[PDB]
Amino acid sequence: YDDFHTIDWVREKCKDRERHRRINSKKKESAWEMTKSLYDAWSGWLVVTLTGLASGALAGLIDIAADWMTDLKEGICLSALWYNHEQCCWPQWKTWAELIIGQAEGPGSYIMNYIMYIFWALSFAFLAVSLVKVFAPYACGSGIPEIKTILSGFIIRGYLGKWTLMIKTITLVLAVASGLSLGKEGPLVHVACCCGNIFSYLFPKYSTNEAKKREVLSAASAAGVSVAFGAPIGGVLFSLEEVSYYFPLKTLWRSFFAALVAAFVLRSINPTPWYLFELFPFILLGVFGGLWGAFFIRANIAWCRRRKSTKFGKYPVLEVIIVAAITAVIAFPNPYTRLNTSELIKELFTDCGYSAIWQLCLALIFKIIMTVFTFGIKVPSGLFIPSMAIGAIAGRIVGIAVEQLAYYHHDWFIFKITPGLYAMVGAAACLGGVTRMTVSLVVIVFELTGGLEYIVPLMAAVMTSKWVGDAFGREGIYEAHIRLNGYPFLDATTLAADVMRPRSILDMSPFTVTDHTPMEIVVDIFRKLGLRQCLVTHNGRLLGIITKKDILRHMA
């Protein structure tokens, strides 16, 4: 296959079985051959394990460097120059103003801090876009859409290579620390799959074949979601639901091992009940979640579809610099948009132990705008953590509203409340209303805290979010960005006449369909079997051909 060509799944199976026959022919001869056979099976298993280990280590390293640089934005701890703001306190911390001006508070100190924050955001974003564009342009974007296309038989050559992995890790640290409204969670699905591909080359079962490396990539997507959220079961379900549609009963256990290994290695790397009357707020958040998703999926796509039909497409670096400058300028004054979005999530998910509503509302509006304008620019811009932050801010605003309403009106028969729970519900609602996921997401949240008492709220909000978000288009953000890039991804009354062109190497087993066959049956054949091209005959006459491209063109 040449680049950007979908794979003939049947031939992948045939060559796999031919290698099985070759190996098994000599397997029984000598003890070394049985050792080699066990070695091949355990080689599949070490591919899963190495993917898990590397994904965990890279997720941990990205987390550490992202935190350090995000805090470097606004100060430096003179004691040790390798601790962040919340690490050398564990006077010691001196922001840039007193480092230069010498004083703590005052108009001059504030202006100096503001300028330094803007400059550091600009410099980090500029480095991110520079490195990605110059060294590995395949490192931009969340990277899950093309992974779903790759697992669906597509070839993008350098999309999961060494250079894409290196530049995505570096520029994902830099883009997280630049303050852009993006994440390092989906990008970690892409980085986990980059590890999966890079390790598949080690062993001959997967380096030679394309079906087997698609299995390994399923496992790697599971591991990536695990490290992204720290939810091994959640990562397995995320691979199951969104990133793949081929699970031959094995690339579930292998996904689970990858996810568990990655979560454990991530952990190593570190140098109150709700009342029934709250479901109405919880469901409310769900609806908001849905709307968000819907809005986003339209708006963002429009923007991306506009970036390909105007000057922007030729100006990536200027775009990233401008977005980073606007983000930094409008983010600093507000003490909630200044914080790392992950730090804002940790702050908004926790319980306390009018200004808050105003500042949270401003944070919400700013994040909603800047994620629409951010997701897509040429930096490793994930989409889990800013969707969670938008949802969490909305949830906490609703929780504070409930607190005030109950306190001022507790005489109501309804009440006769932990805002952290509202933040969790809103985050799950807004994360499932975009990506259009139902259960994997709820499971990720359940393992994100472990409490079983929040399954009803989370399930209710996530389901409502998906139901409301589907009313504006069934396809999610990661599939609506395939239908935009026009990849040949076959989504999982007409005949074969309507979709047939024309209007030692001889493949001796071409699967044929009669012209009178329903089209839906041919689509089903391609989906279940993954055929690349099927002849269409009339009474056994070499009459026409159908290819995935033809089916897709009919779909479009």
Place this chain on the structure above:
Amino acid sequence: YDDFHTIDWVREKCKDRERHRRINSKKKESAWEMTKSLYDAWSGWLVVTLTGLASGALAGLIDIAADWMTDLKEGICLSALWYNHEQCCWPQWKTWAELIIGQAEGPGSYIMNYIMYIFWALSFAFLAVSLVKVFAPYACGSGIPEIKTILSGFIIRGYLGKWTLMIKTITLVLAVASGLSLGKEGPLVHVACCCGNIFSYLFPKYSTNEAKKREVLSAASAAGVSVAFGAPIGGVLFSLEEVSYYFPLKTLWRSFFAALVAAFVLRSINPTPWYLFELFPFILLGVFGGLWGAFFIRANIAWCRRRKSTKFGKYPVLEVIIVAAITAVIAFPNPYTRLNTSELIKELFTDCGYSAIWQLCLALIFKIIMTVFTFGIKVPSGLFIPSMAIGAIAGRIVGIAVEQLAYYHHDWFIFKITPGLYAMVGAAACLGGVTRMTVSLVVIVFELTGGLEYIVPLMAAVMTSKWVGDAFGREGIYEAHIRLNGYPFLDATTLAADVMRPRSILDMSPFTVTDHTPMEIVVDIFRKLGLRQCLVTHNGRLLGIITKKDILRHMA
């Protein structure tokens, strides 16, 4: 399709989609039609839920009645005639000897108790076999093999009906209380699937089609395993791994809801760390588990294959009576085989707070013999709980051996121990060495207690058990009993020439395969697409045919 014919999966899909088209044609017209569409989707969901509820209620009711009758074997509590031995103590309890003879201990009292125990075992077993043979012969056996064949497109008409369900429930209570070395766990997979089928008839989406009820049966098998072990995730995995091989991403969430609902309703119905040096014992149990399975699968099958080639086949009732008489005669004297096997498991899994080894060894030998001779006779004989009891007795024997060895030799550098953990490990090893399951089983055990500290022992023992049991034949007990009954179950170098016969209703879309096609490709096409018969052409000539029967004969 007539009885005992496998289904053409493609036509099932086609009729399903035709019903979708018909419904959607009128769906948008009036609000009632949209309500009907939502009603159809939620009808699939209420089928899952009703299956879960009925399975939970029947599992609870079977548990209650089985316990009461098992204790009725050996006494009666005069205060209330609806409590068991361990329920009216919660002088009150008078065994048959003091009820009739009037005295408690003495040769006469013991003989009277022994005779009463034997007589009650005989009467319960005789009722079990009588009812099954006279009213519903489809109620015998574990019932999972034919369920795996049914989910694989087979028709057995009355195998999942009202009469099979009623008689399996009644005779499963009676066969559990008769002391036969059998269970009510696998039988509960069959009873859950009987509920699934009986409820599929309620709604028109599933009553009309065969693919859709196969999905419902997947969900029902999940619910049945849930009630059997009280492990909803374990039940979902058991359906995933053993009872089905079609999971279109939906009959996972539906399986999970069925399993959760059934476990919860079952709950409603109720009127120490291990040291590293123990893995060597744990793995040892695993090996034993494996061997057991292997032995059993051969031995039992031989017996079953002998029951079909001798007088036995014409004498079911005499066989059940004789087996029950021998079981009762040899079980009473020993205080461990006298107890309900579930009670023996609850006792062998718990910690204390030379006679024991001898009596546990006698229990083990007796159970190993009587389950080989029992599984198969015409009573609802499950195979989970006696395999677990054999494994638990072996595990506890090993745990006691470890206790004695360490106590008498603690000076050994190895030690410088909870037998309940050994019982758990042995039960899991012996249950996975028979059924050849790896992860579903470990997950069931993990949820059977909830402790995470026992995942390494259980995983090690179960994996070793499967590896050792596969060395004597890959097929498990529930598939080796399909290859005995010869059902057309397509298990998930030659051409189509080698396996082709001869050596408004016109189906207009027959899927041809060229004579030069590899056989493996045709088998794969049948498996992934579930075709019933495929033409085979030479240069588009109506040359020969292949049917599932032909492929199966080829393997046979």
